[PDB]
Ligand binder design. Structure first.
Ligand SMILES: C[C@H]1C(=O)N(Cc2cccc3ccccc23)C[C@@H]2N(C(=O)NCc3ccc(F)cc3)CCC(=O)N21
Ligand SMILES: C[C@H]1C(=O)N(Cc2cccc3ccccc23)C[C@@H]2N(C(=O)NCc3ccc(F)cc3)CCC(=O)N21
Ligand SMILES: C[C@H]1C(=O)N(Cc2cccc3ccccc23)C[C@@H]2N(C(=O)NCc3ccc(F)cc3)CCC(=O)N21
Ligand SMILES: C[C@H]1C(=O)N(Cc2cccc3ccccc23)C[C@@H]2N(C(=O)NCc3ccc(F)cc3)CCC(=O)N21
Ligand SMILES: C[C@H]1C(=O)N(Cc2cccc3ccccc23)C[C@@H]2N(C(=O)NCc3ccc(F)cc3)CCC(=O)N21
Ligand SMILES: C[C@H]1C(=O)N(Cc2cccc3ccccc23)C[C@@H]2N(C(=O)NCc3ccc(F)cc3)CCC(=O)N21
Ligand SMILES: C[C@H]1C(=O)N(Cc2cccc3ccccc23)C[C@@H]2N(C(=O)NCc3ccc(F)cc3)CCC(=O)N21
Ligand SMILES: C[C@H]1C(=O)N(Cc2cccc3ccccc23)C[C@@H]2N(C(=O)NCc3ccc(F)cc3)CCC(=O)N21
Ligand SMILES: C[C@H]1C(=O)N(Cc2cccc3ccccc23)C[C@@H]2N(C(=O)NCc3ccc(F)cc3)CCC(=O)N21
Ligand SMILES: C[C@H]1C(=O)N(Cc2cccc3ccccc23)C[C@@H]2N(C(=O)NCc3ccc(F)cc3)CCC(=O)N21
Lengths: 182, 185, 182, 182, 186, 185, 182, 182, 182
């Protein structure tokens, strides 16, 4: 990772209120992004923040740590998909400030239902199944609110992996604009 | 495994000549296929004479256990069940499935009952299908166990929530067996 | 495996025209079952054969080796599900002689779409995908013929794992009768 | 982990009296949090401290190192659940200053009985069982004091994994308020 | 394993011993070993319900439930089952040595007998560990009660003497009541 | 591990060491002992009169590494307070008991565990005898010191450490392993 | 292993009352040798048995199973070392009938103390040590009786690995004669 | 391994007094060869035995079990090297009856010093070193007697791997004749 | 490893002429200790150096690098055993300046013969054995000189692991004094 003069390149972007979500979402990545959001709010509660998303998704609870911190803070958080946003990464792309959710033209967006597992006694499997179904209902309700699509349509469209172009993601309501090059 | 000469037989084949079938391992499809074949063979040799099913098993596959269960109910001879050592999980289900009045345990045998085990990985809807299947399987097992023990389905559900170890005398009181086979002085 | 006097127990059942399909279906299992079917036809071309099925399925081509040998020979092949018939095992259960397909009352039948995999260049993945889709069409067409259900219904009902009781399998047309105990 | 100007982002939050419990609880995590608590008390014995919790739980003794240090020091320790608090993480959430325990709206709280293991001679297994049962009695007694729920209710409600929404965690007495976004 | 031919029938050496009513318990006790020994005991009872059976024990023990399959079959059948320890009888092997017909439990002079409490494990939730602990404690109570009956020692003494590995010579096993006689060479 | 900067940058543990707090927060091996011994000797050189605070959250470990720490504590002039937070087990509980008389503490929910030493021996009969004699002499040395520091008899310590023995903070005070439970205001 | 006509070659030697101890001594080898000794006594109570020893030793309890069976039975058991007899193998060589213990001229005999191990609590290590020391005292006392050497000399001479030629083994009293070729 | 009518091919050769040493020499191979030698002596004490050698050698004590049994029995044992005789295999080739040691023309003979290992305390390494040096002295003394070469020459010529043609092995005195084809 | 103000704790002790030998002795540890000794001689050729020993020993040549550097330099090197000094660690403890070799009261000292290994040809094993025996003679001669015990006594007392208390090590001549606490 190069240095500019001294900042590593990512720390230099954070100085200009750009946060990089560029990996699988796990608790470490979420804790870092949450801390960056809270720090940027403290530096300036009015100026936009820019969340770059190039992520295959990951942990749903880690993604909700980021989601709730975005909604909590005062500054608008713009989202921009570059490369790919899949699964919980596409959920966070849709969670950006209204009118300020973007993708570049060749970015890939993918939506699908949550994944998990359960081993053990029948009653333990039932608890695990009830939990993942309730988690899917929670994700679909918020995605319905942020896209304008019905919960029934989101349920059908996420039954299996669903790949969208940037223009399809705009038509769906996951983003507001394709950022076309000059 | 030793051989006896009467015809030369391995010791298990010699017991099968006297209508004794050994369920002495974890229940998998291979064990079930062997026991099903033995039951059908013994019915063909003599449709009236009892068969003796020895059980020393920690259980195993529910579907493999139902292959044995359904074959026992299908054939004409009574199938006596005897628990020696241990009958756990699907092994205790099969012990309870013997001919009425002919389900036994020796005095220091261990019987254990509990809910079925399994697992699922994948999409939420795949986990839901797997959960619904294992819950329906537990309902099926509990209904039959209620019929064969005389206990209510509600009681069987409570009593199998966790591992429940029974002595031979406790298994008789519960209705999983009819008698403890006490040794002659 | 016990001996009866001298036959191993499975060879004794074959003397009474009973074939055991009691394992995952691979080429070795199929080759054995095909050989047994051809031998039994040669011993007596008129007397029924009994195919016991307790199988989680397996290879589709190995299953079609058994299916085509059943249809080729002159004797009726009865099928009986004891324990479980899943995937290609349920296909073979449905392939028995009309009126002579059975299950015992607590036997489990499961139907679902074929599984596979492909790695490599885009064009290699396309060839593999086209092959498994054509295989699914072939399975569904034959299952429609043997059950009386439409291809559209079979496609919907096999999208995910679908567990049937013996009575449900009779209602579906996968078997003719539940063999209830005296 | 980015730098702000020089602090790593987590060290910058600690300058504003924010401690991150963002991983599984082991002795290393506990020792670090204990040290941070004692340092912040020394800097200012009156000003609140903020404990962020995004944790699946972990070691009960490591969790009690954190619990007893929170109760020992003079400043109030606010707790906030973001993402998830499970097992000993939910215990620590409930341990925050009365009136200053929070969750964000989509945070997950899970409560369950302690896990462990025992191998060896019958008398060794008896010692291990008695120890884990006494540990569960200690956890339930403290959680009863902090939630207002009876020990009998906590015992029943933690027999298996019990997932709570933020609002359910407030109703239970694990938190005081859901921190709703403006 | 060698073959012997008697005039003509060919036997592996262990099958030839079984023809003379000798059963070999010569390995760790698991369900497969127990199923074989149980089958041999039932077969020998059917061949002759009156003639003694000889159970050779050279075993480090093993599964308690597999051992109780053997124990209960010994008590069930009509013939006396002599037990003889050669080499070693440890843990559930020493329990089976003590279970032979009264007056017909033997050891050769340099055989090792070891007694100790049962071993096991549990992993999982507190309530699962409690169920596992209660089960192994009840199993130890059952073992100790039977060993008290077969040796003449009190349950309190058996509990103390099996807290840790306790190695006995053949003569010490006789003094304890685990065997009746040391078979001293002529 | 976070850094604190005072108008000097310290990792948080180095900042605690500036206030004479040493962290024994892991399994005791030679590396941990060498670090703690160096810290004790440095703190004595900085101030020979001011108390040192040894935080203990440890499952124990090496007996010889623990005796490196024990002997350094007794050697130096300053009193070393000991405080158990979380857990002190095995050699960690021995070191808790080794703090300055009247200055051994535990927080209320801390766990203390005492047990006999663990080890191994492999080889010829005479090599096993040497190893056994050594671990028995090591146990007697530990028990003699624990008797001195708790006021309990060697025979009581031997009985109470035969198997794992878990104590609450209040039980550890009653036993003489600590002087006070540090109750919160 | 070749067949002679039908016996495998070892079974043909057993017909002539020759038992082969030709491997490491474990419980399986001891059970086999014990069974062979008891069978040979039953076939002929008067005729000598020949125990061939080419063994590096092994389990002390398995070796004592063989030793006690040799002393129990009525026939004399000659011992002959060919190749090597080490550790418990040399103990069994010395245990043959008085006057009928042999080695061929280039055979190797090795004597040494018993090996073992213990891991666990100090009291467990003490029990293990006391047991191996008592086992060594028993072995050395029997070797003193069968060689004519003092217990003190046997203890000194077995402290470390001690290799003997056939002639040295005769001089020591471990064998009676070197079987020199015609 | 084919059957002739019924014998496996090696058992058929043993019926004509031919023993195959065709593998690495370990105790199992030695025990088998010793048993075959003793059986053939019992069938006919006067008729020659033929020992085929195609072996890379192996255990020195296992080789001495074979060597001493050859010298013990009354029949002459011819040796024939076909393929290769190395290390203890070349020692056994040289041990055949005087005038009846052969090789086929393209057979390879290799001689070299014994191999072993020693691990542990200085005094244990010393015992192991003294043992392997004494073993080498024993091998060299016998090879000197059987070849007519000096012990000093054999020591020098076996310091490293020394490969001989059949004709060179005859010149050395390891064999008596090269068996040239008709 | 903590910092004091800036030095890591071990570098701060080196500033006060204290060298820590606190691990197994390998070439890396020896090279570091040798460098520290040469640096301290340069900093002050007259002032004592303090070598702390808590070591299970290790490489004999690495230990002799340390030993010879101690004897080469002008300053007295005090040695102090804390925790344990075993094998080459106890050799180095005995190598400190006469009158300035110490142990704390509960420190363990263990002496024993050198360990090693050799695998290969007889002549390679002989070279390895002669080397380890010469190494033991060199160690014993120096230990006799430094303790005042005879070489014969040192040989007997190091045949097996020999554990000494601090007081016993003083009686033996391995240290001069037990450093008793005030
Ligand atoms: C265009 C707009 C926006 O959409 N982004 C999102 C974004 C994030 C990461 C990578 C991107 C790549 C391509 C396109 C947009 C990317 C950030 C950008 N910002 C800047 O470029 N700021 C100067 C700046 C950048 C880096 C730096 F180190 C210093 C200054 C902040 C001000 C602003 O309006 N924007
Ligand atoms: C709102 C309140 C609170 O609940 N927290 C907890 C908290 C912790 C971690 C992440 C969170 C994310 C979302 C919401 C609360 C979060 C900390 C916060 N603090 C600040 O935001 N302080 C400015 C600040 C932050 C970071 C920084 F680097 C400099 C200043 C301290 C003063 C205070 O009242 N609060
Ligand atoms: C009842 C009917 C049938 O449905 N089967 C299928 C079947 C196969 C495998 C296991 C089964 C278990 C339970 C129920 C049916 C089973 C075989 C059977 N046959 C026999 O039982 N024949 C005597 C026989 C069996 C075995 C044997 F070794 C000798 C004879 C052939 C004649 C016939 O009509 N039937
Ligand atoms: C029909 C024709 C043929 O195409 N085959 C090939 C074949 C091979 C293997 C499996 C097959 C399965 C299905 C269809 C053909 C199969 C062999 C068959 N033969 C027999 O069926 N011969 C009786 C026979 C079979 C087996 C047996 F054990 C005894 C007799 C030899 C005589 C002959 O013309 N044929
Ligand atoms: C109360 C007393 C004591 O018992 N300890 C032990 C201790 C050690 C580790 C964690 C603990 C957690 C909870 C309770 C006691 C803990 C240290 C403490 N000290 C301080 O708190 N000193 C200010 C201080 C701390 C850290 C820091 F970075 C700066 C100053 C030194 C002065 C003193 O009397 N004490
Ligand atoms: C007593 C009754 C019974 O409950 N069993 C069940 C049983 C099965 C396996 C092991 C057992 C061990 C202990 C006790 C019962 C055991 C079988 C037995 N049978 C026999 O013993 N038959 C003679 C026989 C057995 C074996 C053999 F090889 C030859 C004949 C069939 C006739 C009969 O009524 N019984
Ligand atoms: C007492 C004497 C001695 O025997 N040692 C050896 C020693 C080494 C390592 C750990 C030990 C633990 C306990 C006992 C002795 C220990 C070093 C000590 N020195 C000091 O303590 N010097 C102040 C000092 C220490 C550390 C530091 F960072 C700064 C100054 C140098 C001056 C001196 O005479 N001594
Ligand atoms: C002496 C007595 C007894 O205690 N045993 C137990 C025993 C079992 C296994 C190995 C043993 C080794 C040493 C000593 C006893 C051993 C069996 C023996 N039996 C025989 O020896 N029977 C002839 C016989 C044996 C083997 C054979 F193949 C044919 C016949 C049955 C008749 C009898 O009273 N006894
Ligand atoms: C010479 C004497 C003896 O010391 N042995 C021991 C022995 C055992 C194994 C390998 C040996 C190799 C070399 C030298 C002795 C060997 C057995 C031999 N016996 C025979 O040779 N018996 C004929 C025989 C052997 C094998 C066979 F298959 C048929 C007959 C039994 C009768 C007898 O006195 N002896
Ligand atoms: C004695 C002579 C020499 O043979 N060496 C080689 C040497 C190298 C490494 C380790 C050694 C250990 C023991 C003995 C020699 C060692 C270097 C030494 N030098 C110094 O000691 N220079 C002061 C110096 C050393 C280290 C330091 F950090 C500062 C100054 C340079 C000047 C010189 O003549 N010599």
């Amino acid at each position: 990772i190069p240095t500019v003069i001294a900042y590593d390149i990512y720390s230099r972007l954070l100085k200009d209120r750009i946060i990089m979500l560029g990996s699988q979402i796990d608790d470490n990545v979420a804790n870092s992004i949450v801390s960056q959001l809270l720090f940027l709010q403290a530096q300036d509660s009015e100026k936009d923040i820019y969340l770059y998303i190039n992520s295959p998704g990951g942990s749903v609870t880690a993604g909700f740590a980021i989601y709730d911190t975005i909604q909590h803070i005062k500054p608008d958080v713009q989202t921009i998909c570059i490369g790919m946003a899949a699964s919980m990464g596409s959920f966070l792309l849709a969670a950006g400030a209204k009118g300020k959710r973007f993708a570049l033209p060749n970015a890939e967006v993918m939506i699908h239902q949550p994944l998990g597992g359960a081993q053990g006694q029948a009653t333990e499997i039932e608890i695990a199944a009830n939990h993942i179904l309730k988690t899917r209902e929670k994700l679909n309700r918020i995605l319905s609110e942020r896209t304008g699509q019905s919960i029934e349509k989101i349920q059908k469209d996420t039954d299996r992996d669903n790949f969208l172009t940037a223009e399809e993601a705009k038509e769906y309501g996951l983003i507001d604009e394709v950022m076309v090059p000059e």
